[PDB]
């Protein structure tokens with residue numbers, strides 16, 4: 074392979090305010106905050122991710138390695154790490170949260186134009202990863218984030234690996250059949266997970282195979298069962314999802330095809346998704362709460378040599 078020359082930026086804890094908890098888990102916490110780069114006069118809204126103590130540092134560090142290596146408008150990148158205590162990951166804040174929560178909150182206001190655009194943007198992020206030979210291995214709507222309603226990015230590179238390499242809970246309900254049976258993971262298994270992510274969006278946040286248990290799933294899948302057609306979905310859309318779920322991994326769409334197909338559909342959204350009162354809907358895009366925030370710069374506009 075080629076040398077990875079990404080810069081890992083180390084950030085002093087003095088540099089930022091950990092303004093509030095955003096989320097918490099058995100898996101550690103995520104905070105929102107501000108990062109003021111030393112002597113730069115800019116304020117950058119950020120998310121800070123953290124937390125045995127020695128063996129969780131290793132998992133988190135791998136995530137930083139992958140995150141620091143990616144650069145694309147539809148992938149989240151690491152701004153840097155902070156080395157105090159347990160290691161902290163710093164990234165651009167995505168103010169509207171994850172896409173899964175967002176579709177749940179806004180089902181009434183979400184039009185076909187947006188649903189399809191997200192499908193295009195996610196396929197672009199995934200295609201980028203494939204170009205860099207990354208197999209993500211945890212694609213799901215929970216792991217897609219909303220910068221604005223018009224702009225989403227892929228995240229959560231904790232399970233990521235280079236294609237070919239082999240290196241708690243595994244996401245059964247999003248995984249390709251070969252993955253569940255044989256722990257095989259390719260860009261095409263990511264395609265399968267893409268199918269499920271799209272289904273999650275088209276159902277406005279439904280849980281796939283609600284009620285069923287993970288042990289059950291490889292079995293359901295072997296019989297030939299699949300996720301059902303969502304109400305808003307034309308057969309055109311649903312059949313794209315279905316192709317993402319073929320047994321023959323080489324028979325599934327490539328991410329570059331997914332970009333093309335969804336992109337065509339996004340020209341004529343009302344022809345592919347049927348949504349009641351679709352035309353009326355609008356989603357809102359100051360926004361930065363603090364009073365002295367006119368030195369605020371989004372991370373996308375903050376570039377380093």
Ligand SMILES: */C=C\C(=O)Nc1ccc2ncnc(Nc3cccc(Br)c3)c2c1
Pocket residue numbers: 095096103119120121122162163164165166167168169170171172173174215216218228229230
């Ligand atoms: C579905 C819940 C959720 O993901 N909430 C959330 C909201 C905003 C946000 N902004 C920036 N980053 C993240 N998550 C994240 C994932 C991996 C690494 C890092 Br540093 C941050 C969120 C998450």
Ligand SMILES: [Cl-]
Pocket residue numbers: 243244245246247287
């Ligand atoms: Cl699961």
Ligand SMILES: [Cl-]
Pocket residue numbers: 177278
């Ligand atoms: Cl729900």
